[PDB]
Every structure is written in C-alpha cells, then in structure tokens.
Amino acid sequence: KEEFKALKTLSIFYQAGTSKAGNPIFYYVARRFKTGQINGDLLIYHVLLTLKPYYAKPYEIVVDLTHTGPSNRFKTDFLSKWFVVFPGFAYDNVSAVYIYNCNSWVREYTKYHERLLTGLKGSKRLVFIDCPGKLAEHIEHEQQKLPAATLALEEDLKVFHNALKLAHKDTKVSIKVGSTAVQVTSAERTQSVFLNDIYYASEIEEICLVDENQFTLTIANQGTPLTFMHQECEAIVQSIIHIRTRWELSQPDVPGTLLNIALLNLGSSDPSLRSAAYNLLCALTCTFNLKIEGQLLETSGLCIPANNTLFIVSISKTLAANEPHLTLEFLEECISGFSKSSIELKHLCLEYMTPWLSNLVRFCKHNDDAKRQRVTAILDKLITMTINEKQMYPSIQAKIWGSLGQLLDVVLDSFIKTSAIKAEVMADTAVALASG
Amino acid sequence: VPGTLLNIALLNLGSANNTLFIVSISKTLAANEPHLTLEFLEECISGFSKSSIELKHLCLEYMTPWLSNLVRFCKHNDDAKRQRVTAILDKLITMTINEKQMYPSIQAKIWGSLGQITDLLDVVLDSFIKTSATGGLGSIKAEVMADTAVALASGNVKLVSSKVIGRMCKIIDKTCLSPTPTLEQHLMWDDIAILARYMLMLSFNNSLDVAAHLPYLFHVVTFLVATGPLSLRASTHGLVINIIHSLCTCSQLHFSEETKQVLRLSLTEFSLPKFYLLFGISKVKSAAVIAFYERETFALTSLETVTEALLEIMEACMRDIPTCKWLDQWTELAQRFAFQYNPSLQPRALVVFGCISKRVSHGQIKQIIRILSKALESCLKYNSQVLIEATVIALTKLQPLLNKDSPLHKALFWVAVAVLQLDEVNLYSAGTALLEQNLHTLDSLRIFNDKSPEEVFMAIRNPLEWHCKQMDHFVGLNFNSNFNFALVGHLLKGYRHPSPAIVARTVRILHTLLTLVNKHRNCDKFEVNTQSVAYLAALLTVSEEVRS
Amino acid sequence: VMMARRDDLSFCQEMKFRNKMVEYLTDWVMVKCLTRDLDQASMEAVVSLLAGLPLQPEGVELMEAKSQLFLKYFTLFMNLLNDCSGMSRRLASLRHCTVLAMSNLLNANVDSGLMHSIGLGYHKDLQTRATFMEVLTKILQQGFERLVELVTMMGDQGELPIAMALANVVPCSQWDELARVLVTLFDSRHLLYQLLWNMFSKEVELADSMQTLFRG
C-alpha cells in the first residue's frame, strides 16, 4: 500500500523524452535502488505499471550506471526474475538500451553472472555510451534527461591523461578531478567499452603520495587501496586533497575482534570450543584473505588438542607480519580478553600478543591523531594489565615489556601519568623496557 | 655445588624485576659452561617446585636456554650421564603435570625448546611413555603427556612423529611376538592406548606431518578402529578426521581441486552418523567431546567399509603424487599382520589387506585358505569365528584380483558354500558376500556363457568328490544328486538372516544364479525347467517379477 | 509451529509482527517447574521468531534505535544464560535454546549485533562461546563448494543414478519445478540429451500400450 507510493518518490525509473527514432525513453537509475531496502517485487511492479501504457509499442531505455556498486546489485534470484516477469513482446519492443557510465564493478558483476546474461552478450541493442556527448547520436540534446546529479559530474574537470592503474595487469587510465568526485576512466574493456569508476570526495578515506610518480587512494568500504602511476602525481594528489578537504569543511559538525576470539578460544579446555574456534579462524582467513602458512581447512568435528599454544602462536605472528592493519584492533581486544580470562588463557594471550607488539610502531609513524591515541590507549591498557595480573607479572615483563623496548616517549609518559603499586610496577617494568 | 649455587643465585636475583638480565646471564653461561647444565636443571626443578607461582614463571624463563646442552651428556650411552638427563626429563614432566596454571608457559618455553632437540627425543619419549605407563589410559599422567606430546613435535615434527608412530607400529608388531586372544587384554594394551592418545593430539599438528606417515597412521587405525573403551574409539575417529583434514592442507602437498574435493567430501562422510557406528561410537552427539564397555562386538563389515573409504582417500591422493609408495607400504604392513599368527589383530589385518590390495598370488590365497582351515580346527578345540569371517571377506576382495585363467575362482564358490554350511550369522553374511562377488567375478570372466554353473563347480568337486561325499552326507544336501537345489538349500537360510541387507544380498545371488543357469541354454531367465525351478521356488516370496 | 509454517502463511507486515511477538514473549522470560517450562517454550518460540528477522523499532536514529533494541534482547538472553550457569537437563535445554536465540538474532541483524556479540565471545561459558563462533562463521562467509556434478553423474550404461532416484521419491507437488531444475542444469552442461534419453526411456518402458504413452 503506502510503502509502494514510496518507490515513485525514489524515481529509480522514470519516463522522459523521445528518441530520434520517435520512441518514448525510460531511465533506470541503478544507484537509486538499494538491495535489501526496497521490495524487489515492488520496484519491478512499478517498472511494469510505468511501461504498461507503452510497452505494446517500441520504446527505449537509458540505464544510468553512474556510481553503481554492490549496494545496488540485483541478487541472483532477483536478476533472473527480470527476464521472465514481462510479456514476451515487451522484451521484443526494446529497440535500444543506452548504457551510461558502466564501471569496473558492474563489469565484474557481468562476469560473475555470466550464466544469466548470456542473451545480452554481443547483443546489438545494448549501446554503451562512450562519453556524455555520444548520447546525442541517439537522443536530441534538449531531449536528454539524465539525473541532474549525473550531469554535475561532467563539469569543470581537471583531467590527467595517460595515468597507469597498477594491478596484476597495469591498465591505461585517465584521472579526472571534479569538485565533488574523482573519475577514473579506462580504455576499452570487455563489447569493448570505456569504463568510468566514480569516487566521491566523501568516500575518499585516505590519499597517500608514494613516489613523485605514484600515489594511492583508500576508498571507504573497498579494502584494497587503488594505486596509480603518473608523472604529475604531486599535482593529482594536491587536487584530490583539495576536494576531500572541501567535502570535510562542509559537513554539519570485525577482523581483529573475531581473530582474538578465535585465537583465545583455540586455547580452551573445552574440545567443542577448540573445533568451533578453529572453524572461525578458517572463516576469517577466507573472508579477509589473511595470508597463512601451514594452510587452514574448514570442517566439522576436527578434534584439536588442548595444548596447541605453539600452533596458535605460529598463526598469530605469521598474521602479525602479514596483516599489520589488524594490530591496533586486535591488541586492544586481546588485552580486554586478558581481564576476562583464567590464568591459563591470560598466559596464552601473552604468547600470541608478543608478535603483534612490533607492529605498533607503524601506527605512531602514521600521522593520524586517532591512531596515535589508540596506540597510547593500548599502552595504557597493557600497563593496566601489568599492574593487575600479578602472578603473570614477571612473565608479562619478559614478553611484553622486553618486546615493546625494541614509541618510547609515549611509553614513558604513559608510565609516569599512570603512576601520577602502580608507581612501583612502572619503575620495576622500566627495567625490562630498558633492555630493548 | 656449582649448579646448586647458580640456581640459588638466579632464583634469588628475581626474588624485584631483572628477568631479561637473568635470562641473558643464563644464556651466556649455558653457552659458555655446559657441564653446569646437568646440575643446574636438576636444581632448577627442585627450587621451582618449592617456589611461588611468580618465582615459577621467572624460573622457567631462566631454565629455557640450558636444555640445548642436555644432548651432550647423552652421546656417551654410559648409564650415569644418560640416567641423570632422563631423571631431569622425568622431573620436567612431573613439573608439567603438577603446575596446571603454569601449563601453556611450561609447554611453550620448556617443551618448545626441548622440541628443537632431535637426539634427545628418544629419551624424552620413553620418559613420556613410562610416565603414561604409570596408570595407562585414564591416568591424568598419561592424559597430560599426550597433550604435551604436541609440544615435543612442534620443533622437529617429522622426527618426533616418526618415533611416536614408529613405537606404535613396533608395539603392535610386539603383540604378535607374544599373542593373546583379545587385543584389549594384551600384555602391551596400555602402551598402544597411550600412543593412540598421543596420535590424536599430534594428528592436528600432523597437518605439518602426514606425507611420510599416512600409511602407518591407517595401519594404526585399522587395528584400533572400534576397539577398547569408548574414549579411545572417539580418539581413533578423531585421528582419521584430523588426518583427512591434514591431507586437505599440508603446505608440502599440491593435491588437485578434484582430489581436495574428494577429501572435503570425505570429511563430510566421516562426520556422518554412519561412520560413528563404524568406529564403535553410538549414543554420542560429537566424537570430539568424548575424545577429550559397550563394545559393539566388532563387525568386520564395519572395518571393510572404513578401509575402502580410506582407500578411496589414498588412491585419490596417489594419482596426484606419483613419487609415493604409500599403498605398497600399506599393503606390506597389512599383509605382514594378515598372514602372521595373532588372534586379535590378524582378522582385522586380513580384511584390510584384501580391501587395499591391487594384486595377489596363488601362494597368498593358499595362506588365507590355510588360515581359514586352521581357524576351523581351533573351533573344534569366538576368536576363530572372527578369523573365519575375516578370511572370507579377504577372499571376497581378493578374488576380483585373481588371474582370469586361475582355478581358484571356481574353488572359492565352494569355500563360500562350506562357510554357509557352518551356521553362524556373520559367517553366512561373509560367505554370501564371497558368493555374490564370486558370481559377479565368474560372469565378468565370461565363464558361464558356454557352461552351466552346475558343470563348472561340480568339475572342481570331482577330485574333491571323495571329501565332498562325506560333507554332503553329514549336511544332508547333495549337489551330485541335484546341484541347483543343494545350492538353493544353502541360500534359503539367507532368508532367515536377522539383517535385511543379507536377505537382499541372498535375493541378488538367487537372481544371479537364475539368470546364469538359463544363460548357458540361451533361454529367458524365468523359463521354468529342471535347473531354473529351484531358484524360482526360492525367489517366490521375494520377486514380483517371478510371481507375475 | 506458526513460524515453521510461516513459509506457507501470508503477511502484510511480517517483520513488524515478528518483532512485536519477540517483544511480547521476551516479557515472559523471567509452580517453579512450570515457569521454567514456560521459559523453555518461550525461548524455543523466540528462536523460531528470530530466524532471518531484521529488527524494527516503532533513518540514522532508526539504525541506532535498532541497535538499542538489539542490546535489550541480547542482554535479557545473557541474563538468562547466567541464571543457567531432569532439573539439570531442562536447564541445559534452556541454555542451548538461549544460545540459538542469540545466534539467530545475530544472523539477521549483523550491523546492530556484531559489537555486542564480541561481548558474547568473551563470556565465561565455553559452550555458548563455541556456538556463537559458529554463528560468526555463518555471517563471515555469507558477506567452488557447489558440486552439482553428483546430480549430473552418469553410471555405466548412462544410469543418471541421482536424478532417477530423486524422480521416484520427490512428492508430486514439486514435480513442476523438478523438471525446471533438471532441464536447466543438464542443458547448462550439454547433457540435455542424456537426461531426455533416460527419462523418456522409463516412460515407454512402463507404459502399458502405445495409447498410454506420454498421456496424462
């Protein structure tokens, strides 16, 4: 009922204009559909009740793929449902589908769902629009009705040509900087089409100049930074920082946690707990692609020994080398788990923690005040543990404080400020710290 | 006094923190002044056991470097030096059992360091095993020792596991050096049970190990698979699960996606309730929980099932690893135990040898049928029956291997008949399996195509006829008078059999024979005649095709 | 039982209905024997209600309200398991059910749940931890192992053992989609003729006469 009048407010599908072949034109704006938020069936129905008065006669579709990502996808069962819901003639009466701003993700989506899209392969009705200008070869300029937000991306662009996107295979790209976004346009990718990956200022989490010829962009929710090479990187980076800053000034005002709970539970006296933990470690390894020696296999009923400390430790430090980004997230949660644990589980926590400590320098070499604060808070919690857990205390000193001794202003200020048994423990712990 | 005073000094030096300085001095003196080690580690454990938990952490930290020198004293093999290292290891073991809240600490630093040290590992293992021997399975001394054994392996996996598994194999062989009727009773049962405990713990670390070992581990599974108290059974199920998982991930191996998928599906299959019943586990949600008596009086058909599944695991792998000798080594190991006289193990071995083998000889068949005969002599004088069942299952698996022109295929049909005559439930099941597989074998050899089964089998009887007359006159069935009805007489008892599976097998055998008797005439299979009628009458309660 | 049948029933506002139902039944989660059976039953119902249930309070505030509602149910289940920590088996059954309640609550509500769920991961009870970690396992591989070969496996003489056994045991109601599943699958692997040759052969084989052939 009332929740259906809501889709017409979203306008993910709207009629607008007539083609140069005298047919009505309809726009699908992919990014406006959020999978899991709107009832698929509802959207489909709305598209039907939009096409009903027209789909008996020829008509054309413009699919605006601008900024389309995972959050806009059609799930397998939803995808296929699109190819059967309509009357056969409705499919036949599409004379042209204009595809605008197709991108790398959609391309990947196309290959992943190759099976359901076979009929679209090499279809003559799919016209990928090379650039905003070629849409006129099919639609009068005054006839074009792309969303205003799409058209905004096309103005006052600073263009850097002949950049190189670094990946298994390096690809030739253009890097374009607009006031609200970065657009990375690629040369012919498989029909042969130009792709346009769009990164709004708001999703550019970090920008880092590596060489005078190379920089990285970290994009919110994409895990792996994009890496580019270009002789004018200094200037590209400067213009992107400028755009990110502009966005910032305008604003009104799992791996680590789960990895600790896996590792610490592998310790347990309970056998079922060990098997479950081992499966969780496997799942984390696969999901977060965590690079591991002595490879890990998911399965039920795997009867792991109670004494496995040397295995847990081996996994941990291999991870500590391989997966440093985890370190802050992981260590803080481990130290919290220390306070929860039995003495046996506390001891085990020290052994597996020990490799991770080394990584903490990376975070205070990083200039982020929050990351420097989180290292400082980890050291405060390490101190808190060191004071509280007295039985462990000579052993804690040997593992933890020796390794930390290898920051040390921040360490000494944390000792002094905490001291300001606490003070005695900091003095006695400073002996270990000095050995490094 | 040198070791005593140096222990007193390092202990009291901590009594506050200078722990890494103490360790640096300890390292330095351990490298420089090795003779101190014998006295020092003895004195360390004496002071450790008396001291507080805080001092115990400190104590282990300073102990850690010294362990390396313990090999020096051992090279000589004169008692006194080797004995005091052996005493030091027993004291370190005792220390490990006692301090349940030092427990990961002791294992990681003391046992991980000792794990580096190859030479000593035989002394260490005999100390562990003798510590476990103090009460056998169920003794907390043994239980902790098994859990600790993984730490021993963690440094030099391949040698430690090779010695543990080697001791297991050698001790299983030692059972045959002085046989007992039943394995759980055996003079060395505790020694086996202890090593099986270690093997479970090791088996997850065997994810590093398996490639040299895999045959020997299945040899151990073969004897143990459902034996003993229920915790050892659970352990032995876990041992296989962990080995299959280890074969899916050993970083040294490179198995294909097909082979890996076969192993993944095997883990799934071994996780099923079917496999729990095979391993003599019943009335449990999870084997793991019990691993960390109601013997199903062991059914050899269960071992047969396990063994073919482990064979499909091994075969899948062996396609990918052309440079291995695994199935040949398993064949030799099983063969040795199958042929040698040992009432407890020999049946199990025969079953396995038969299942795994890829070739056989008339001299091996002679040994098997001689074992069957000797087992029937022992019945004149339960274990004997299980040996008979085993030999008959072995004959079942072995007979498809035999050469196409061998007399023995025809001979084994009469071995099956004689076995059915015995009237024992599992023997009859085995004889019908033998007979079922024998008739498939002889039909695959084309042998029926120009002769009745009656002529083929009765020819082999003709030399035997003097003996067969005495059998038939005491049985009260006479194949010379009418072959088809005598054979059917034997099969009819199969309809009584308590198991619906054996009844259905019996029906398949009758159907096979019906088809075969008419096959040499070129008749339709349901053509009633003086030869087919017996099978038709036998089939009358069980076949809708016959009835219609 | 109603939740098991939920796949059969019709709902205007299913998510709201289930949310309100958990809200009501959770009040009951607190003669002693009967109240403990009420706890067990209530929790078993709550485990059924929570099974793919997104939470819905009555946009940015809505996600935070959803998190606060998650925290209420989750805390109540934790308290119930702390209270747990024939009389013995009933308590263990209540505990197992409570763990499954948390599990299902998490499995749907990931964005609201994960942080509080780590608090389960710490929790003093090892059995609950283990189960919770299997729940995490479901989320993390959610967001090849998909062997259909076994269905398209052909025995000697082209038996198609799995499909033919599946054809004679599946209820007649699902026959309409079983044909859709097998035809699309075999055609995707260029074995359509093998499927048709096997199924058509069985029809003529059992058909009484030529006029019964493929009629009905």
PDB file of N, CA and C in Angstrom, chain A residues 212-277:
ATOM      1  N   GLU A 212      57.320  10.378  -6.404  1.00  0.00           N
ATOM      2  CA  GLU A 212      56.984  11.542  -7.205  1.00  0.00           C
ATOM      3  C   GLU A 212      56.176  11.080  -8.417  1.00  0.00           C
ATOM      4  N   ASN A 213      56.044   9.763  -8.571  1.00  0.00           N
ATOM      5  CA  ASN A 213      55.363   9.173  -9.721  1.00  0.00           C
ATOM      6  C   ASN A 213      54.199   8.254  -9.354  1.00  0.00           C
ATOM      7  N   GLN A 214      53.896   8.136  -8.065  1.00  0.00           N
ATOM      8  CA  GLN A 214      52.917   7.147  -7.631  1.00  0.00           C
ATOM      9  C   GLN A 214      52.164   7.547  -6.366  1.00  0.00           C
ATOM     10  N   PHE A 215      50.859   7.291  -6.349  1.00  0.00           N
ATOM     11  CA  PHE A 215      50.048   7.581  -5.171  1.00  0.00           C
ATOM     12  C   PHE A 215      48.947   6.542  -4.980  1.00  0.00           C
ATOM     13  N   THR A 216      48.388   6.485  -3.775  1.00  0.00           N
ATOM     14  CA  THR A 216      47.282   5.573  -3.507  1.00  0.00           C
ATOM     15  C   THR A 216      46.040   6.299  -3.012  1.00  0.00           C
ATOM     16  N   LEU A 217      44.876   5.758  -3.361  1.00  0.00           N
ATOM     17  CA  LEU A 217      43.618   6.215  -2.797  1.00  0.00           C
ATOM     18  C   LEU A 217      43.032   5.080  -1.984  1.00  0.00           C
ATOM     19  N   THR A 218      42.634   5.370  -0.755  1.00  0.00           N
ATOM     20  CA  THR A 218      41.887   4.403   0.028  1.00  0.00           C
ATOM     21  C   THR A 218      40.413   4.798  -0.007  1.00  0.00           C
ATOM     22  N   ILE A 219      39.578   3.913  -0.544  1.00  0.00           N
ATOM     23  CA  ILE A 219      38.156   4.193  -0.722  1.00  0.00           C
ATOM     24  C   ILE A 219      37.331   3.484   0.338  1.00  0.00           C
ATOM     25  N   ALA A 220      36.425   4.220   0.974  1.00  0.00           N
ATOM     26  CA  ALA A 220      35.592   3.663   2.032  1.00  0.00           C
ATOM     27  C   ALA A 220      34.912   2.376   1.574  1.00  0.00           C
ATOM     28  N   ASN A 221      35.075   1.316   2.363  1.00  0.00           N
ATOM     29  CA  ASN A 221      34.449   0.017   2.092  1.00  0.00           C
ATOM     30  C   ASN A 221      34.997  -0.730   0.881  1.00  0.00           C
ATOM     31  N   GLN A 222      36.255  -0.507   0.519  1.00  0.00           N
ATOM     32  CA  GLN A 222      36.799  -1.238  -0.623  1.00  0.00           C
ATOM     33  C   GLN A 222      38.096  -1.968  -0.299  1.00  0.00           C
ATOM     34  N   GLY A 223      38.458  -1.951   0.979  1.00  0.00           N
ATOM     35  CA  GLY A 223      39.580  -2.718   1.489  1.00  0.00           C
ATOM     36  C   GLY A 223      40.922  -2.358   0.886  1.00  0.00           C
ATOM     37  N   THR A 224      41.107  -2.717  -0.378  1.00  0.00           N
ATOM     38  CA  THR A 224      42.392  -2.551  -1.045  1.00  0.00           C
ATOM     39  C   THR A 224      42.512  -1.206  -1.753  1.00  0.00           C
ATOM     40  N   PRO A 225      43.502  -0.404  -1.345  1.00  0.00           N
ATOM     41  CA  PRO A 225      43.768   0.906  -1.941  1.00  0.00           C
ATOM     42  C   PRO A 225      43.982   0.783  -3.443  1.00  0.00           C
ATOM     43  N   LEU A 226      43.551   1.790  -4.192  1.00  0.00           N
ATOM     44  CA  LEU A 226      43.888   1.875  -5.604  1.00  0.00           C
ATOM     45  C   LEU A 226      45.256   2.526  -5.701  1.00  0.00           C
ATOM     46  N   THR A 227      46.067   2.056  -6.640  1.00  0.00           N
ATOM     47  CA  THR A 227      47.408   2.590  -6.817  1.00  0.00           C
ATOM     48  C   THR A 227      47.574   3.110  -8.237  1.00  0.00           C
ATOM     49  N   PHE A 228      48.004   4.359  -8.367  1.00  0.00           N
ATOM     50  CA  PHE A 228      48.215   4.922  -9.692  1.00  0.00           C
ATOM     51  C   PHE A 228      49.634   5.411  -9.892  1.00  0.00           C
ATOM     52  N   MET A 229      50.035   5.448 -11.155  1.00  0.00           N
ATOM     53  CA  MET A 229      51.338   5.935 -11.537  1.00  0.00           C
ATOM     54  C   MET A 229      51.127   6.998 -12.589  1.00  0.00           C
ATOM     55  N   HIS A 230      51.820   8.118 -12.416  1.00  0.00           N
ATOM     56  CA  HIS A 230      51.721   9.242 -13.322  1.00  0.00           C
ATOM     57  C   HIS A 230      52.828  10.218 -12.948  1.00  0.00           C
ATOM     58  N   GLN A 231      53.369  10.911 -13.942  1.00  0.00           N
ATOM     59  CA  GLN A 231      54.492  11.808 -13.708  1.00  0.00           C
ATOM     60  C   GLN A 231      54.084  13.064 -12.935  1.00  0.00           C
ATOM     61  N   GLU A 232      52.784  13.317 -12.859  1.00  0.00           N
ATOM     62  CA  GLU A 232      52.289  14.524 -12.204  1.00  0.00           C
ATOM     63  C   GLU A 232      51.547  14.217 -10.904  1.00  0.00           C
ATOM     64  N   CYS A 233      51.901  13.095 -10.283  1.00  0.00           N
ATOM     65  CA  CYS A 233      51.260  12.636  -9.053  1.00  0.00           C
ATOM     66  C   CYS A 233      51.171  13.715  -7.976  1.00  0.00           C
ATOM     67  N   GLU A 234      52.243  14.487  -7.805  1.00  0.00           N
ATOM     68  CA  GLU A 234      52.237  15.559  -6.818  1.00  0.00           C
ATOM     69  C   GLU A 234      50.969  16.387  -6.991  1.00  0.00           C
ATOM     70  N   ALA A 235      50.695  16.778  -8.230  1.00  0.00           N
ATOM     71  CA  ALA A 235      49.570  17.664  -8.527  1.00  0.00           C
ATOM     72  C   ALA A 235      48.227  16.945  -8.450  1.00  0.00           C
ATOM     73  N   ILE A 236      48.185  15.688  -8.884  1.00  0.00           N
ATOM     74  CA  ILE A 236      46.950  14.915  -8.773  1.00  0.00           C
ATOM     75  C   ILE A 236      46.535  14.809  -7.311  1.00  0.00           C
ATOM     76  N   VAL A 237      47.487  14.425  -6.471  1.00  0.00           N
ATOM     77  CA  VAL A 237      47.240  14.278  -5.043  1.00  0.00           C
ATOM     78  C   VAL A 237      46.781  15.592  -4.427  1.00  0.00           C
ATOM     79  N   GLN A 238      47.430  16.692  -4.810  1.00  0.00           N
ATOM     80  CA  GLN A 238      47.079  18.009  -4.269  1.00  0.00           C
ATOM     81  C   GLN A 238      45.638  18.380  -4.581  1.00  0.00           C
ATOM     82  N   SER A 239      45.194  18.075  -5.795  1.00  0.00           N
ATOM     83  CA  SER A 239      43.842  18.441  -6.211  1.00  0.00           C
ATOM     84  C   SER A 239      42.788  17.549  -5.561  1.00  0.00           C
ATOM     85  N   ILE A 240      43.162  16.311  -5.238  1.00  0.00           N
ATOM     86  CA  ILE A 240      42.234  15.387  -4.585  1.00  0.00           C
ATOM     87  C   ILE A 240      42.121  15.702  -3.093  1.00  0.00           C
ATOM     88  N   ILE A 241      43.249  16.025  -2.466  1.00  0.00           N
ATOM     89  CA  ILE A 241      43.220  16.517  -1.092  1.00  0.00           C
ATOM     90  C   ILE A 241      42.318  17.741  -0.999  1.00  0.00           C
ATOM     91  N   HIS A 242      42.454  18.642  -1.970  1.00  0.00           N
ATOM     92  CA  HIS A 242      41.652  19.866  -2.012  1.00  0.00           C
ATOM     93  C   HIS A 242      40.165  19.548  -2.042  1.00  0.00           C
ATOM     94  N   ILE A 243      39.808  18.526  -2.805  1.00  0.00           N
ATOM     95  CA  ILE A 243      38.410  18.142  -2.962  1.00  0.00           C
ATOM     96  C   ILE A 243      37.864  17.426  -1.715  1.00  0.00           C
ATOM     97  N   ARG A 244      38.715  16.621  -1.088  1.00  0.00           N
ATOM     98  CA  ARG A 244      38.353  15.900   0.120  1.00  0.00           C
ATOM     99  C   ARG A 244      38.181  16.900   1.251  1.00  0.00           C
ATOM    100  N   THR A 245      39.092  17.867   1.317  1.00  0.00           N
ATOM    101  CA  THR A 245      39.041  18.903   2.344  1.00  0.00           C
ATOM    102  C   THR A 245      37.780  19.740   2.200  1.00  0.00           C
ATOM    103  N   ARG A 246      37.465  20.124   0.969  1.00  0.00           N
ATOM    104  CA  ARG A 246      36.249  20.876   0.702  1.00  0.00           C
ATOM    105  C   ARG A 246      35.043  20.116   1.241  1.00  0.00           C
ATOM    106  N   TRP A 247      34.965  18.820   0.937  1.00  0.00           N
ATOM    107  CA  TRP A 247      33.877  17.990   1.453  1.00  0.00           C
ATOM    108  C   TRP A 247      33.854  18.000   2.982  1.00  0.00           C
ATOM    109  N   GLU A 248      35.026  17.885   3.594  1.00  0.00           N
ATOM    110  CA  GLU A 248      35.124  17.853   5.052  1.00  0.00           C
ATOM    111  C   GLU A 248      34.636  19.149   5.696  1.00  0.00           C
ATOM    112  N   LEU A 249      35.182  20.271   5.251  1.00  0.00           N
ATOM    113  CA  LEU A 249      34.805  21.561   5.810  1.00  0.00           C
ATOM    114  C   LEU A 249      33.296  21.805   5.756  1.00  0.00           C
ATOM    115  N   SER A 250      32.618  21.131   4.832  1.00  0.00           N
ATOM    116  CA  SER A 250      31.197  21.374   4.606  1.00  0.00           C
ATOM    117  C   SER A 250      30.286  20.499   5.465  1.00  0.00           C
ATOM    118  N   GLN A 251      30.847  19.515   6.157  1.00  0.00           N
ATOM    119  CA  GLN A 251      29.990  18.630   6.934  1.00  0.00           C
ATOM    120  C   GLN A 251      29.430  19.286   8.205  1.00  0.00           C
ATOM    121  N   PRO A 252      28.138  19.051   8.473  1.00  0.00           N
ATOM    122  CA  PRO A 252      27.497  19.595   9.668  1.00  0.00           C
ATOM    123  C   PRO A 252      28.149  19.000  10.902  1.00  0.00           C
ATOM    124  N   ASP A 253      29.152  19.691  11.440  1.00  0.00           N
ATOM    125  CA  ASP A 253      29.773  19.313  12.705  1.00  0.00           C
ATOM    126  C   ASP A 253      30.874  18.269  12.501  1.00  0.00           C
ATOM    127  N   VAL A 254      35.788  -5.828  12.956  1.00  0.00           N
ATOM    128  CA  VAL A 254      35.401  -7.234  12.854  1.00  0.00           C
ATOM    129  C   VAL A 254      36.604  -8.166  12.715  1.00  0.00           C
ATOM    130  N   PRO A 255      37.602  -7.906  11.858  1.00  0.00           N
ATOM    131  CA  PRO A 255      38.673  -8.869  11.693  1.00  0.00           C
ATOM    132  C   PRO A 255      39.455  -9.045  12.992  1.00  0.00           C
ATOM    133  N   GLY A 256      39.751  -7.956  13.696  1.00  0.00           N
ATOM    134  CA  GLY A 256      40.565  -8.022  14.902  1.00  0.00           C
ATOM    135  C   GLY A 256      39.836  -8.650  16.064  1.00  0.00           C
ATOM    136  N   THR A 257      38.603  -8.194  16.281  1.00  0.00           N
ATOM    137  CA  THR A 257      37.791  -8.723  17.367  1.00  0.00           C
ATOM    138  C   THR A 257      37.532 -10.212  17.184  1.00  0.00           C
ATOM    139  N   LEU A 258      37.115 -10.634  15.986  1.00  0.00           N
ATOM    140  CA  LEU A 258      36.883 -12.041  15.719  1.00  0.00           C
ATOM    141  C   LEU A 258      38.168 -12.857  15.759  1.00  0.00           C
ATOM    142  N   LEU A 259      39.277 -12.342  15.238  1.00  0.00           N
ATOM    143  CA  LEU A 259      40.531 -13.068  15.282  1.00  0.00           C
ATOM    144  C   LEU A 259      40.968 -13.320  16.718  1.00  0.00           C
ATOM    145  N   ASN A 260      40.840 -12.342  17.612  1.00  0.00           N
ATOM    146  CA  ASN A 260      41.140 -12.608  19.009  1.00  0.00           C
ATOM    147  C   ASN A 260      40.225 -13.690  19.560  1.00  0.00           C
ATOM    148  N   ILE A 261      38.905 -13.593  19.353  1.00  0.00           N
ATOM    149  CA  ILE A 261      38.017 -14.602  19.927  1.00  0.00           C
ATOM    150  C   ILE A 261      38.279 -15.978  19.358  1.00  0.00           C
ATOM    151  N   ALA A 262      38.690 -16.084  18.101  1.00  0.00           N
ATOM    152  CA  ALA A 262      39.153 -17.352  17.594  1.00  0.00           C
ATOM    153  C   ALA A 262      40.412 -17.803  18.318  1.00  0.00           C
ATOM    154  N   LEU A 263      41.470 -17.006  18.309  1.00  0.00           N
ATOM    155  CA  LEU A 263      42.732 -17.460  18.849  1.00  0.00           C
ATOM    156  C   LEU A 263      42.589 -17.830  20.320  1.00  0.00           C
ATOM    157  N   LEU A 264      42.007 -16.957  21.135  1.00  0.00           N
ATOM    158  CA  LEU A 264      41.902 -17.211  22.562  1.00  0.00           C
ATOM    159  C   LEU A 264      41.093 -18.466  22.849  1.00  0.00           C
ATOM    160  N   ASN A 265      40.027 -18.696  22.091  1.00  0.00           N
ATOM    161  CA  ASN A 265      39.238 -19.895  22.295  1.00  0.00           C
ATOM    162  C   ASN A 265      39.952 -21.163  21.845  1.00  0.00           C
ATOM    163  N   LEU A 266      40.821 -21.118  20.832  1.00  0.00           N
ATOM    164  CA  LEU A 266      41.615 -22.285  20.480  1.00  0.00           C
ATOM    165  C   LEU A 266      42.370 -22.805  21.690  1.00  0.00           C
ATOM    166  N   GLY A 267      42.757 -21.948  22.623  1.00  0.00           N
ATOM    167  CA  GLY A 267      43.364 -22.353  23.891  1.00  0.00           C
ATOM    168  C   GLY A 267      42.548 -23.296  24.782  1.00  0.00           C
ATOM    169  N   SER A 268      41.220 -23.289  24.684  1.00  0.00           N
ATOM    170  CA  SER A 268      40.353 -23.694  25.800  1.00  0.00           C
ATOM    171  C   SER A 268      40.528 -25.142  26.273  1.00  0.00           C
ATOM    172  N   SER A 269      40.168 -25.427  27.522  1.00  0.00           N
ATOM    173  CA  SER A 269      39.966 -26.809  27.954  1.00  0.00           C
ATOM    174  C   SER A 269      38.762 -27.460  27.260  1.00  0.00           C
ATOM    175  N   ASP A 270      37.774 -26.722  26.739  1.00  0.00           N
ATOM    176  CA  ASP A 270      36.636 -27.364  26.070  1.00  0.00           C
ATOM    177  C   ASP A 270      36.932 -27.785  24.616  1.00  0.00           C
ATOM    178  N   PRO A 271      36.717 -29.051  24.237  1.00  0.00           N
ATOM    179  CA  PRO A 271      37.089 -29.542  22.920  1.00  0.00           C
ATOM    180  C   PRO A 271      36.219 -28.938  21.829  1.00  0.00           C
ATOM    181  N   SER A 272      34.915 -28.854  22.068  1.00  0.00           N
ATOM    182  CA  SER A 272      33.988 -28.303  21.093  1.00  0.00           C
ATOM    183  C   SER A 272      34.324 -26.844  20.827  1.00  0.00           C
ATOM    184  N   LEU A 273      34.729 -26.123  21.863  1.00  0.00           N
ATOM    185  CA  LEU A 273      35.141 -24.749  21.718  1.00  0.00           C
ATOM    186  C   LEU A 273      36.341 -24.641  20.803  1.00  0.00           C
ATOM    187  N   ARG A 274      37.333 -25.514  20.964  1.00  0.00           N
ATOM    188  CA  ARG A 274      38.513 -25.509  20.098  1.00  0.00           C
ATOM    189  C   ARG A 274      38.137 -25.760  18.644  1.00  0.00           C
ATOM    190  N   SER A 275      37.306 -26.756  18.369  1.00  0.00           N
ATOM    191  CA  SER A 275      36.894 -27.026  16.991  1.00  0.00           C
ATOM    192  C   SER A 275      36.170 -25.829  16.403  1.00  0.00           C
ATOM    193  N   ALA A 276      35.267 -25.238  17.173  1.00  0.00           N
ATOM    194  CA  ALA A 276      34.494 -24.107  16.704  1.00  0.00           C
ATOM    195  C   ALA A 276      35.411 -22.928  16.403  1.00  0.00           C
ATOM    196  N   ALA A 277      36.334 -22.648  17.307  1.00  0.00           N
ATOM    197  CA  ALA A 277      37.294 -21.589  17.121  1.00  0.00           C
ATOM    198  C   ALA A 277      38.125 -21.807  15.868  1.00  0.00           C
TER     199      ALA A 277
END
